[PDB]
């Protein structure tokens, strides 16, 4: 048994949000089915009709301090863009990574990222980075390389 959670992209800001529930569905003749979404930590007034195929995906994963080795240049990640009036998760691509020795606080690595939507670039810590679930594959590979 493996849990599968989802995140959906809002038409309001183009950011991704955790899905708490799928409330209903609607189908069109021209395609692209849509699903009514209740967002985690948001009321009913924020419910939204979401394009299922292009704006709903498997949930991005907040990184363990160990899992920094699964964040590589070229990757798509879900990155927390924190501003003065707004702080949202946006799709970004890793351009480079400065990997430094960990400490008691955990990961000390820095990642240069570029947000897909505004082309802005930012240096972020691992705590602001969410991995695409498929990168677990990499980790699994790494786990196979261990000693028995």
């Amino acid at each position: 048994s493996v849990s599968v959670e989802f995140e959906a992209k809002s038409a309001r800001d183009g950011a991704w949000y955790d899905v708490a529930a799928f409330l209903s569905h609607r189908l069109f003749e021209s395609g692209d089915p849509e699903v009514r979404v209740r967002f985690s930590g948001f009321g009913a007034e924020e419910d939204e009709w979401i394009n299922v195929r292009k704006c709903v995906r498997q949930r991005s994963l907040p990184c363990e301090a160990t899992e920094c080795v699964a964040v590589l240049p070229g990757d798509l990640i879900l990155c927390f863009q924190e501003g003065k009036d707004q702080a949202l998760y946006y799709d970004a691509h890793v351009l480079d990574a400065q990997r430094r020795r960990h400490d008691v606080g955990g990961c000390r690595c820095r990642f240069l990222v570029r947000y897909d939507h505004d082309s802005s670039e930012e240096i972020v810590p691992l705590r602001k980075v969410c991995r695409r679930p498929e990168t677990d594959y990499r980790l699994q590979i790494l786990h196979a390389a261990r000693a028995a």
Partner: peptide, 8 residues
């Protein structure tokens, strides 16, 4: 695996 709290 808790995410940061998004602020719109």
């Amino acid at each position: 695996r808790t995410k940061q709290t998004a602020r719109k």
